Structures are given as structure tokens and as C-alpha cells.
Amino acid sequence: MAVFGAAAPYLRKSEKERLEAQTRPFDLKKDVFVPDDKQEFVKAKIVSREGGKVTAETEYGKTVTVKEDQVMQQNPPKFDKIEDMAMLTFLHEPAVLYNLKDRYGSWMIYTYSGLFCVTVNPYKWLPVYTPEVVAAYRGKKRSEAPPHIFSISDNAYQYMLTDRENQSILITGESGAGKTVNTKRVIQYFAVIALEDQIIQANPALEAFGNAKTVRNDNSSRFGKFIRIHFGATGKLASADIETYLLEKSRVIFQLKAERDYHIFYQILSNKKPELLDMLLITNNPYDYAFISQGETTVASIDDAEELMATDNAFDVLGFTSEEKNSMYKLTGAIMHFGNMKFKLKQREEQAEPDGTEEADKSAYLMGLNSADLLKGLCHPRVKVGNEYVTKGQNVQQVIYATGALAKAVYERMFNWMVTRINATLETKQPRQYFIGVLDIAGFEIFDFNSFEQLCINFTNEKLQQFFNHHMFVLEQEEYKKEGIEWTFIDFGMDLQACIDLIEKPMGIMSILEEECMFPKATDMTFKAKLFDNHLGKSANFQKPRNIKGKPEAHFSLIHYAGIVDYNIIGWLQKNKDPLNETVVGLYQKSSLKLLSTLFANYGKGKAKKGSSFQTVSALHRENLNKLMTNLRSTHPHFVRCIIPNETKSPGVMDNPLVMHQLRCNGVLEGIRICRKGFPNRILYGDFRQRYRILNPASRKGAEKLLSSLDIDHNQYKFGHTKVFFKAGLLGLLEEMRDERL
Amino acid sequence: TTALVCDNGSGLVKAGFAGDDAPRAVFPSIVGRPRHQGVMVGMGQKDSYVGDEAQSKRGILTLKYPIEHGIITNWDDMEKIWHHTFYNELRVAPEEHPTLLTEAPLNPKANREKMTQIMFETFNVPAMYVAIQAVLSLYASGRTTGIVLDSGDGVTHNVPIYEGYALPHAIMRLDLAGRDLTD
Amino acid sequence: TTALVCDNGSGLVKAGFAGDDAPRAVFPSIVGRPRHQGVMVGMGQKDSYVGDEAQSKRGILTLKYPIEHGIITNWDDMEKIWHHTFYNELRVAPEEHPTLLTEAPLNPKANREKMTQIMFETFNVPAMYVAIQAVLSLYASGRTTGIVLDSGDGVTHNVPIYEGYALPHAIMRLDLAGRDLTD
Numbered sequence A: 001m002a003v004f005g006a007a008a009p010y011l012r013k014s015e016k017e018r019l020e021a022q023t024r025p026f027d028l029k030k031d032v033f034v035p036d037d038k039q040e041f042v043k044a045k046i047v048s049r050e051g052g053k054v055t056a057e058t059e060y061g062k063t064v065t066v067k068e069d070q071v072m073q074q075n076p077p078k079f080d081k082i083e084d085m086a087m088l089t090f091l092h093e094p095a096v097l098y099n100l101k102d103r104y105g106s107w108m109i110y111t112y113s114g115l116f117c118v119t120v121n122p123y124k125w126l127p128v129y130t131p132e133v134v135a136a137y138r139g140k141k142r143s144e145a146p147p148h149i150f151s152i153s154d155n156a157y158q159y160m161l162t163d164r165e166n167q168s169i170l171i172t173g174e175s176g177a178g179k180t181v182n183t184k185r186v187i188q189y190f191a192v193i194a195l196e197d198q199i200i201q202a203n204p205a206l207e208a209f210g211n212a213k214t215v216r217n218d219n220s221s222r223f224g225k226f227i228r229i230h231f232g233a234t235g236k237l238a239s240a241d242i243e244t245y246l247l248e249k250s251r252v253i254f255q256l257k258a259e260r261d262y263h264i265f266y267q268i269l270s271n272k273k274p275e276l277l278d279m280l281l282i283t284n285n286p287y288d289y290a291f292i293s294q295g296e297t298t299v300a301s302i303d304d305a306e307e308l309m310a311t312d313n314a315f316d317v318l319g320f321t322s323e324e325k326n327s328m329y330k331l332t333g334a335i336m337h338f339g340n341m342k343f344k345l346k347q348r349e350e351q352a353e354p355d356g357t358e359e360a361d362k363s364a365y366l367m368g369l370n371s372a373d374l375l376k377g378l379c380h381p382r383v384k385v386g387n388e389y390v391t392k393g394q395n396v397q398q399v400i401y402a403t404g405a406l407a408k409a410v411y412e413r414m415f416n417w418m419v420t421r422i423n424a425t426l427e428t429k430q431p432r433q434y435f436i437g438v439l440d441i442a443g444f445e446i447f448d449f450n451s452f453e454q455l456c457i458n459f460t461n462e463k464l465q466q467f468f469n470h471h472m473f474v475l476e477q478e479e480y481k482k483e484g485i486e487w488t489f490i491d492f493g494m495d496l497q498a499c500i501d502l503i504e505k506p507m508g509i510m511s512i513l514e515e516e517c518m519f520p521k522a523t524d525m526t527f528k529a530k531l532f533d534n535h536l537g538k539s540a541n542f543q544k545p546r547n548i549k550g551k552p553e554a555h556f557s558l559i560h561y562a563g564i565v566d567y568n569i570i571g572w573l574q575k576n577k578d579p580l581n582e583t584v585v586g587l588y589q590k591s592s593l594k595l596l597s598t599l600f601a602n603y604g605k606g607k608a609k610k611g612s613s614f615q616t617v618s619a620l621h622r623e624n625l626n627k628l629m630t631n632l633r634s635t636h637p638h639f640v641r642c643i644i645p646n647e648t649k650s651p652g653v654m655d656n657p658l659v660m661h662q663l664r665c666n667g668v669l670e671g672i673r674i675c676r677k678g679f680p681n682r683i684l685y686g687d688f689r690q691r692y693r694i695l696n697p698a699s700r701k702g703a704e705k706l707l708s709s710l711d712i713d714h715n716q717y718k719f720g721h722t723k724v725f726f727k728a729g730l731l732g733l734l735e736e737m738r739d740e741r742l
Numbered sequence B, C: 001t002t003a004l005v006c007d008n009g010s011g012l013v014k015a016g017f018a019g020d021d022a023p024r025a026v027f028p029s030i031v032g033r034p035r036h037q038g039v040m041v042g043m044g045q046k047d048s049y050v051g052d053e054a055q056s057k058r059g060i061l062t063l064k065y066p067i068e069h070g071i072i073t074n075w076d077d078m079e080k081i082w083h084h085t086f087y088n089e090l091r092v093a094p095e096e097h098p099t100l101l102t103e104a105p106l107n108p109k110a111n112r113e114k115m116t117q118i119m120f121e122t123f124n125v126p127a128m129y130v131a132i133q134a135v136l137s138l139y140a141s142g143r144t145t146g147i148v149l150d151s152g153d154g155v156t157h158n159v160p161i162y163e164g165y166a167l168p169h170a171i172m173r174l175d176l177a178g179r180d181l182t183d
């Protein structure tokens, strides 16, 4: 342990201190966990089990009684502070919570969780990240080294170098909790093992165009950032490639009452730059603009002024000139003025015509278009039939939907073009051999007012969890075939995929939603009735909602890996439609501005081109998720989990419900549940002999003789050639009879 | 896979894939035959010009409409029309594309029977369906009620629909159409 | 807790919580069935429109009153009426709410027995009671004597009451009511 310098204590405690802390009072019979009202569970001692009534004295001094059917054991001291949760003698839902709690109490930041890695952000500076640790760590394998990000990073690097296959890193956590600095230290480690400054410089540009304020977090990120780190032929750092996925467009137009839009619009409305406002003719009052005022106007999340100036400076020191920046601001201002458009019915026709044109005139002036041509295109879209063009009619609702779809699409194209420009500027001329992917994705967010945007995020997270489960099953089968201990070949994917098949497959929730908006008289009541007709009782996951603590509304409830989630139907049908307008896209292509580059290509011997009207956000989401899965599945994945310890900034204190929610959304409970159905506890024959041979004082014959005298049932264990597998109950029985033996 | 929507109509055949905003191929439903002898040797004129090609050679052909008022009267010409539409216009194999067909109300049952038999046997389409013109017209109009007046080149009819429920006893069919106007 | 006062009557179901000044939900007691086939697909029409909804779809439905003259002749329709009243008009679960019921004098005992059986079995109400439609009207008038003439839509009856003591031998029932006037 002398190699790990003075940072070893946080990295790993010494054997002497461990042995000193091993001996402390603990009765396995009546010091078990007890349910609590303030938190999920508390540490307490039960006086006695007097039938269906118990008396537990918690650390707070309460004498509450609890039902006897929800009691469960507590970790013995000899297994406390375990590095890996997979080796825990009893797998219980809050046992992992309490182990992490008392490990952070002694400041063990990094903890193995089988295939997962748990890392809680410390609130004070630590010497673990000192580069002397990095330089001297090389030469240690994952198994021997105490848990840390460097262990899995070196394992992935070795796998890439020797196995000659791509490796990917998957991080999970809330933005602003240290994810950015964690990625910074990871890329610094990669550079040490051989463009960190460029990444840090370009990060605020992506952060400002992709983050928005939500109820849970003031700096919540939405898009699925993904960075590919390339290497040279001789295993040396070569270049970095960055991509973006699953950017949400619904946030641009529809916002929840207590949530903001993207930081872009608020940052533009900063008064410290007066030239932009007057040159764009922007109304300085955010209240007037329709697209912004619907949500919460402003919060004290981050002071926007110097952030905007920092982004402008980062753009200025970047490769392109200021004219492109000005084009960016003016295009954003044009997106802003799309909400001022108004339309009214005609004389004796169902057709719609504009009333005001000043906002249309100014928007056309900014885009370099003609106001009359743009209005004619919006009101009368030209379409091609056979060999002849004909004009189509539009009412008020359709033109409003088209106006919203155009604003969403142009924003998407701008973001994608910006990402391409950043990737080109970052690009070096080094050859790109095998790469190491880094994936960042939004977590399994839970609210009391879940909607379509949260539904998409939950479905994506569930797909990712299913992928992780399949990977862990493959790893377990590989270990089983390595050890020759092979049983229970049933796959662990279909159990979770049962819920997936009711979302993406035909006759699923998403498919019915997509079909319903096409029916021209659809309403929310009809949509709910169809969902109930097609899924209530017929499926094993769809079920009635629950009304708890006066929740505002609930229409239907699903079951996921994270528990019961209910969603609100109201408002889903209106915002699912994304009908684009072809003639407006042609007019953009005919424009005199850079905007034509963004809309350069947009929409016989076999064709399936979906029409402009037949365009739903859900379909694009499914397509993007599928194209992402066709890319991520090609690489060997690794998982990193980040957990916030408390809601407050104060170090040391914890919020138990918060840690429960983090564990539930991170899927650790699912991992331990999948591990518990098999044989999670695996001990070597030599260790078992040096620990448990004393029980019957006197290697296959000896082990068999020893186990035959312990009344161990045949089905409770697996007898191998290198390791012997035991069930959780066997370890507890052995611990108890060792206790009575001593 | 994707579905195929073919509308035989009357005087104009229009077809295209499902989920499209407009038919890809629109051309008159005309089969023409050369009525003269032909003296040049080597060119090898074909014995039947079908579709929009017959419009180009209009001056040396006898244009015959395979259907008079909705009812198909010259079946062989209709196999020719359908083959042209499926191969030279859409360039797709109907072996893996379900086909939706449109058919006017109050027509002989033998017409629908022969249509389905031809589709299933000659072209081996995996699946097919026949629908009424008025219901589709009401679909495209963004409505669920109202009486629709469908007047093509073959026949004019009204079908009243209320709340997605039709009124079969109130369907009126009139054979006056565009062809009679031309005459 | 609170008690529910349901008044089935005939042709008008009115209900509300006890202690209210006026009934909360009043709607006709009819059950509608679509007598046509339906051509538009995907709408998913329900097979039975119940309550005030059926009044808006009179043109495509056939209306059958589940109560002819005081007595119930179609028990499935009456169960549908009760379910609609409990779950849509009032939006209250009858699991923890007693119900008070009314019916006309001189009615078959099987009707009352079946009503009680259905209300304890299907809905599982904690308790229920049946009262004469005339005595309640006498309460509502702030009186304790005199005769009351309850001419509804199903049946017309007279109940003489003096000082709170009913006189069963003087009760006269007549089947002429509003339905016969409409006919």
C-alpha cells in the first residue's frame, strides 16, 4: 500500500485499521433492519418478536412497531465496508445504501458494484487525483487494485490494445454534480497514458445550446453527448471525434409551467450587449414573446451575462470568424419571431389568411426572403403530383403546426451544423485507429407530472438498462464456461423486453399515439379509451393509475425497472405532430443567407419516403435510438455511475430518500436482483479452508465430507474445481454456527 | 414492409406508396392499338401502346377505355393497365407489397370478385383490400361527418356519413359524369 | 361519511350526495345501440352509449328505456345506468357510501329483491335502503299530513298520509303517465 502514497487512505484503508474496526458488538438475531417513517429504513435493535408486534429502538430513540413480514437481516461486522456489493452476504435494498453511507462516512469515494462502478462526488479537495498516483498506478490489474476510475480505464485500455476491439465508457449522473470535471479528469488520464484544452474550451458552446432549467436541476442536460477518442497505430493518442444524439425538439415550443426553455434565448436577452438587440430589433421584454413567456420566465440558476460573454470569447478564439457568429444570433432571433405570426379565417371559406404582417416583414427581412412569398408558401403550400404541381389548402391549426415544425427543424439543423463545425475544428491530421467511446445520457428522471418528454427519456433509459442486463448476462455466461459451472441458461433480456415490446412494437403505446394524431378528429378521451381497450388486461405491464397524496392527475401507470411510473395524457396529441412544409424549405434553399447550408437536403424503383404530414416526433426518436443502438452495440461497454450524496451543499450529511431515488434510477437494484437469483457468492477453496475448516476439525473429498456434516442441502450450492458457489442463506448459517462455535 | 395504394379510377389511373402526400404516377387509363398497316421494316412496332405512351402516338391509334362507368368491361386491357402501373411506372414487384384498391358504390359483385382474383393470381400480391371512394374522400378532408359528392369521369354518387356511420339506404348514384360532358 | 340518494324513476335518473340542496347529476335514463355498421376504421366506437351521451347521438342510435312502468325489465341496461351514475356523473366509488333508493308503491317483490341483490353484489355498497317515492315528497313539502300525487313518467299514484301514519288500503295506482301522453 506504500505505492499509493498519502492518497491511499481514501483509496483503501490499511489492514490494521480494518482489523481494529472489525471487532464491535452486533447481534445477528435482533439488530436487523426495520422500516421507518422519516426514511425507508433505520438502524435499530429489536427487543423481541412478540408475535405480530415488535419493539425496535432506533438511534433517534423511537419505539415504533412494524409488521413482521417486512423484516430483514443486517450485515455482520466481518463483512461490513465491503469493496464489492456482489460479495455481500445478504443482498437487501437499503443494505447497499447503508454500506455506501458508512463508506462515505470514512471517505471511501470509489466502490465496486460488480459490473457497475459507484462514485460519489466529494465536496473537498483530495490527493487521489494527484498525477503521482497516475504515474505509479500502471502495472496493476482490475482485480488486485482497490476501486477507482483508473482501474476500469486501464482495463479498457488493455482490452483495446490486446483483444483488438473497440471499448466504450458509459457514465450516468445528473449534470452539475461533477460530470464535467469527471470527464475532464478521465481525458487527462487518457492523455497521460497517451486535446484536453480544446475540449474544455469547446464545452461551454455545447452546454449553452443544449441545457435547460427543469424542476429537478437548474442545469439539466438533454441531448445525448457522445465523444469518440481515437488512437494511433502504435497505441498512442491521435485525435478526438464528437457526436450528438437524441436532442429533444419539444422543449423549443412547449415547456412545463415551472420549467424554462434552453438557455440560448434568455442569454440573448442579456442587456449587457446593446448592439445585438437594436440591430436585430429584439423586444427587450421577455414577457411579450409568446414562445418564452409560457414557461417560467427566469430563475437564479446561473448569471447569464458573463456566461454569454465567455461563450462569445470561446467562439472568437475559435477557427471561424465573427460573421458566422452574427449569423447565428440573427437566425436565433428569427426563430424567436416565429411566435408572433397570426392567422384568421377568410370571407366565405375555411382557408386561413394572415392579418398582421409586420413581424412577417421583419422576419423575411432578416432571413433575406420575401414576406409575400413566405406568406404564400405558408398559406398555400405547393406539392408535386405525378408530373404537375398543384396547390394545397391549409387551415389555422395546420399552419400553426407547420410554423412550429419549421422552428424546431431549423434549430435542429443549426445545432447539427455547429457540432460538425466544432468536430472539424477539433480534428487533427492523425490517423484514426481503434477508438474509445465516451457516452453521456440523461438519467431516468421521475416527476409527479410525467409527460411525453419524460416518457421518451424513460424509454431510452430502459433500453440502455436492457442492453446492460444483456451484457452482464453474457459476462456471467463467459465466467460460467470459464469455470465449467454452467446452469440457468435462460436469458435475462426478455423479462425487461416485455415492457419494451409495449412501446416500440406495433400496437404499442407509441404506435397508437402516432396513428391517433393522423385521424383528423382524435381527442384525448378517445386516445385514452383506445389505450384501455387495447392494453388493459391484455398486457402484463399496462395498469390503472394510482392517486397518492393529492397528485394533480394520472391516467395510466406503467411498470419499469425503476418501479411504477404514471404519465399524463393531456397535451400529448397536440405536440406529437411535426408537419414540415416543403415549399418553405425550397424558399430557404433559394435564400441569400447561409441558412441554405443547413437545409441543403430535406424532404420509384422502391420508395418508402414518409410524407411531410406523416411526421411524428416519436418516429424520429425511435429512428435515432435504433441508429444509436446499431453503433453502440458494436463496442464492448463499460459503466460508470455517479450518485449525489445530498440535496444540500453541506458535506457529510445525506438524504436517504435521495440516495434511494438515485440507486433506483441507476439500476443498481436491478443488478443486485439479477445477481441474487443465481449464485452471487464465490469463494476460493483455500480461503474456505483457512476460514471454515475449523468447524469440523480432522481437496474434493475433504470439502465434500465437511459439507455433508453441515446439513447443507444439495440444491443450495454448486461444487466447482476452482471456486465453490454458495447461496446467501448458507453464508449466514455458517456465520451463526461459527459464532456459536467460538 | 410498406403498403401500396392503387386507384384505378376512371379515365385516370393514379398510384403510389402509402404514407405519401401525393400519388407518384398519374396517367390516363387508355389502351391503344395501331389501325394502319406500317411499311417500314426493322423498327418492329409493338401491338399495344398502354398508358401515357398512347397519348404521344394519339394520331395513329384507336384509344379504347377499358371501363365505361366504374365497371370493368375489357378485362385484358385492365391486366395491361395494372401491369404497366406496377412495372413501368412504380418499378416495384407486387410480390412483397400489399395493395389497396378503390371501388365505387353500388357495383356488381362479380367486378370485385374478378378484381381480387386477378390481384391474387396474376400478380400474387400478399394481401389486398377494397374500399369505397367516398370514405377515402372523407378521410382526406379532415372530417368525420358530412355528405360527400364524388364526381369523377365515370360516375357521380353521394354517400352520407355521420360520426363514422354510413347510411346505405341514402346512397344515391348518378351515371352522369365527365365523359358525358365531353360527348 | 356521506350518503348517496339515487332516484331512478323512469326516463330521468337524478342523484347526489345527502344534505345537498338540489340533485347534482340529472340525465335521461336511456341506453343507445348503433343500428348501422360503421365504415370508418380506427375510431373504435363503443357498443353502447349510455346516459346524456345518447341524446347527442339520437340520429344513429336506437333508444330503449330500461324501465317501462316503475318496474325494471332490462336488468343489464339498468346495471349500465347505475354504473354510469356512480362512476362518471358523480365520480365517487360506492365502496364506502350508503345509498338510498326510491320506487313506486305496489310493485313486484322480485324487482326489489333483485335490486338489493345487484346493489350488494355488483357494487358492494356498505348499506342501502328503499323508500316510497311519495313519502319523500311529503317530507320535502314540510308537511306531515295530506295526500300526495306523484305523477311521473312511468306511473301515477296517490298515497294518503295522516300524522305520519300511512293508509295502505287507500293507495291508488294508475299506469297513465308522461310516456302515454307523449305517445
Ligand SMILES: Nc1ncnc2c1ncn2[C@@H]1O[C@H](COP(=O)(O)OP(=O)(O)O)[C@@H](O)[C@H]1O
Residues within 6 Å of the ligand: B008, B009, B010, B011, B012, B013, B151, B152, B153, B154, B155, B178, B179
Ligand atoms: N380543371 C378541370 N375542369 C373541368 N374538368 C376537369 C378538370 N380537371 C379534370 N377534369 C375532368 O375530370 C376527369 C377526371 O376525373 P377523375 O378524378 O380521374 O375520375 P376518377 O377518380 O373516377 O378516375 C377528366 O375526364 C376531366 O374531364
Ligand SMILES: Nc1ncnc2c1ncn2[C@@H]1O[C@H](COP(=O)(O)OP(=O)(O)O)[C@@H](O)[C@H]1O
Residues within 6 Å of the ligand: C008, C009, C010, C011, C012, C013, C151, C152, C153, C154, C155, C178, C179
Ligand atoms: N313542464 C312540463 N310539461 C310537460 N311535460 C313535462 C314537464 N315536466 C316534465 N314533463 C314530463 O315528465 C316526464 C319526466 O317525469 P319524471 O318526474 O322525471 O319521471 P320519473 O321520476 O319517473 O323519472 C318527462 O317524460 C316529461 O315529458
Ligand SMILES: [Mg+2]
Residues within 6 Å of the ligand: B009, B010, B133, B150, B151, B152, B153
Ligand atoms: Mg374517383
Ligand SMILES: [Mg+2]
Residues within 6 Å of the ligand: C009, C010, C133, C152, C153
Ligand atoms: Mg318519480
